């Protein structure tokens, strides 16, 4: 589905590069060359602070694929 | 809690002792006795080596999983 060599499937970075290039070439566009940036740490996953007590009646919810959304 | 405190004691010593993978025994292997900041499992391994000293049975070496009591 991504039109790559097999082993690349063990590498997400390549998995997307290939699919994006396929879709982009599909309408005769051009992909920018790979540049260079810094290995930098940014804020990540955030977790609430629960008070260690007992919960009797409690409900729950979630976000369907939050980051792609 | 009470009845399991009872049952655990009569259980076999080969089903209740903590399972831990033993490695780097050598650096704590001081005269066959536990070294400084010796983990529980390394301490147990060295106790085994002293106990099996003179018995001529299979000893323990770096990287061998053990069961500690």
């Amino acid at each position: 589905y991504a039109k790559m060599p097999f082993s690349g499937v063990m590498s997400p970075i390549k998995t997307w590069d290939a699919i994006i290039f396929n879709s982009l070439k599909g309408e005769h566009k051009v992909i920018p060359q790979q540049g260079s940036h810094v290995k930098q740490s940014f804020p990540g996953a955030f977790v609430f602070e629960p008070k260690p007590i007992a919960r009797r009646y409690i409900m729950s919810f979630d976000l369907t694929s939050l980051y792609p959304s | 809690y009470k009845n399991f405190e009872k049952e655990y004691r009569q259980l076999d010593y080969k089903v209740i002792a903590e399972v831990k993978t033993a490695n780097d025994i050598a650096k704590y292997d001081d005269k066959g006795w536990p070294g400084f900041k010796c983990p529980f499992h390394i301490r147990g391994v060295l106790t085994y080596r002293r106990a099996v000293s003179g018995l001529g049975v299979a000893p323990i070496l770096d990287g061998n999983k053990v069961m500690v009591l």
Partner: protein, 69 residues
Amino acid sequence: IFTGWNIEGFAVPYIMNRVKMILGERSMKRFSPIGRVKSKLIQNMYGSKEIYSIDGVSILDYLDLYKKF
């Protein structure tokens, strides 16, 4: 020769990152007379910051010059 006090730590990087983030790399590379602005990433002492190298002008941080000479 393009100097200043603590220049590769706060001046050179900030100006070049801002021109990249505002004008694009095609104008960021206009600093050098030969059109080559390659970013080195390491500063391995704590791995904190990043140095820059504009091929054609000799960056010489006056803070380092004073610290060493």
